[PDB]
Scaffold this active site. Sequence first.
Site, short mmCIF file in Angstrom:
data_model
loop_
_atom_site.label_atom_id
_atom_site.label_comp_id
_atom_site.label_asym_id
_atom_site.label_seq_id
_atom_site.Cartn_x
_atom_site.Cartn_y
_atom_site.Cartn_z
N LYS A 16 32.97 21.23 63.96
CA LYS A 16 32.31 19.96 63.71
C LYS A 16 33.25 19.09 62.89
CE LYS A 16 27.80 17.99 63.33
NZ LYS A 16 26.37 18.02 62.91
N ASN A 18 35.39 15.47 61.67
CA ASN A 18 34.98 14.44 60.70
C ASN A 18 34.10 13.33 61.31
OD1 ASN A 18 36.93 15.24 58.21
ND2 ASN A 18 38.06 15.36 60.15
N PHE A 19 34.45 12.87 62.51
CA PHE A 19 33.67 11.83 63.18
C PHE A 19 32.36 12.39 63.73
CE2 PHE A 19 37.85 9.75 63.35
CZ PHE A 19 37.50 8.53 62.85
N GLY A 20 32.35 13.70 63.99
CA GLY A 20 31.21 14.37 64.60
C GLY A 20 31.64 15.65 65.31
N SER A 21 30.77 16.16 66.18
CA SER A 21 30.99 17.44 66.82
C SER A 21 31.98 17.39 67.99
CB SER A 21 29.67 18.04 67.29
OG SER A 21 28.91 17.09 67.99
N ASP A 135 46.76 15.01 56.62
CA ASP A 135 45.78 16.12 56.63
C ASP A 135 46.29 17.48 57.21
OD1 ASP A 135 43.14 16.79 55.66
OD2 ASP A 135 42.35 16.64 57.67
C1 LIG Z 1 40.12 19.38 69.79
C2 LIG Z 1 40.14 20.84 70.25
N1 LIG Z 1 40.77 21.11 71.37
N2 LIG Z 1 40.65 22.41 71.58
C3 LIG Z 1 39.96 22.93 70.59
N3 LIG Z 1 39.63 24.27 70.44
C4 LIG Z 1 38.89 24.65 69.35
O1 LIG Z 1 38.57 25.84 69.21
C5 LIG Z 1 38.52 23.68 68.44
C6 LIG Z 1 38.87 22.32 68.62
C7 LIG Z 1 38.44 21.45 67.60
C8 LIG Z 1 39.32 20.54 67.02
C9 LIG Z 1 38.92 19.70 65.99
C10 LIG Z 1 37.63 19.77 65.49
C11 LIG Z 1 36.75 20.70 66.03
C12 LIG Z 1 37.15 21.54 67.08
C13 LIG Z 1 39.60 21.97 69.72
#
Ligand SMILES: Cc1[nH]nc2[nH]c(=O)cc(-c3ccccc3)c12
Length: 289
Positions: A16, A18-21, A135
Amino acid sequence: TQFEERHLKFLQQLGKGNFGSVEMCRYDPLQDNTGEVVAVKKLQHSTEEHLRDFEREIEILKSLQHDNIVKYKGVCYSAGRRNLKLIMEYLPYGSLRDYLQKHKERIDHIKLLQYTSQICKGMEYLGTKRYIHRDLATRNILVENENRVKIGDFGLTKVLPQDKEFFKVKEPGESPIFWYAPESLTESKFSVASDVWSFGVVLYELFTYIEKSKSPPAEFMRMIGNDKQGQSIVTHLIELLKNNGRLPRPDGCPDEIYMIMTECWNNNVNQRPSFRDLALRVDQIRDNM
Ligand SMILES: Cc1[nH]nc2[nH]c(=O)cc(-c3ccccc3)c12
């Protein structure tokens, strides 16, 4: 790069952000299974500000193409084009932070050094765009496989003005203070050099193996006094760092690697190494052996 909402099929909730899920979805325009699996980022509260911020992330992410940066795929204008969702590559092994904890069986120092190098190279690439990540932390790096990590989490990224080497962020409130360079804590100044400081903490994280009590927050809080709450924490962290208080060398961490950490953690901004310096040094270390 324009994905239709009716063909985005839910598979799993991921983190989850920062902007959301974020969800894992299958994009199946042929409606029969057999599509690409993708990551789909949603905005919980689409206010004027949160949207502008979400849109900024999309522009940033769309502008980067590098082996060690998470792939931008497109956007989905759902709810009759009255909502927007960011579509990205899905990396199956989640955050580097979780991976290090869950998959120790297949991680050694050589793998750690490979990840280190890959992060440095992504960071060199960001610097050519004058992007400050702000970050960097293992929770914000993603794992494609045992041989490949990619920097993600461009929600906080900023562009340096034409001819300003630092960016002052109006007020960092609820920050990951234990990854921040002193001048970021004291002056809200972020720069390539403050990214290097944070990278130092990332290198520490790698070599602690995200072990029980050795995380940067846990360690810093042990040094400062576990009793402390609220602003006294910040007050003491600053004072500690200013007079050369530093995270300890992890168990089993080579001196050469700890020295890389300590060089990144220079109070003197100009004296910190570049990401190009760091990539070369790490790759040389790997290539010797
Ligand atoms: C953005 C993303 N691409 N692939 C992912 N695999 C994950 O297990 C988790 C993410 C993810 C990235 C940022 C925030 C939340 C989930 C994720």
